[PDB]
Symmetry: C2
Subunit: 71 residues, 2 copies
């Protein structure tokens, strides 16, 4: 579970970050249920300071489209 090392670059676009996050989860064969928990957690925690602050402001329970918009 190297998912821990998938972090958002300082100037990396959230989109690019999201692509590499979910590609890693596929490899690690995560179930849709695992994919749900990781989005509410790890996706949010491994993002850059700004996005992480915006996503943490959106609240627990935001759709991926909401998070993208926010960043």
């Amino acid at each position: 579970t190297s998912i821990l090392d998938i972090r958002q670059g300082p100037k990396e676009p959230f989109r690019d970050y999201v692509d590499r996050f979910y590609k890693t989860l596929r490899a690690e064969q995560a179930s849709q249920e695992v994919k749900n928990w990781m989005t509410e957690t790890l996706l949010v925690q491994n993002a850059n300071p700004d996005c992480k602050t915006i996503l943490k402001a959106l609240g627990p329970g935001a759709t991926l489209e909401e998070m993208m918009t926010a960043c």
Copy 2:
């Protein structure tokens, strides 16, 4: 999913940290499969600097008893 806020105190014993991590997951009704991913990830990432460094040294794929021993 407030699991993000369950973090290890600066001098809090790992055991105490582990109790509050898994109690929160129960409330959030996490499945055993969700409980598995969170241990390899969030449990490790929300620990204090020392433990986080030890657990990150143990490698991805360590049992909970191994992580406790390590801290």
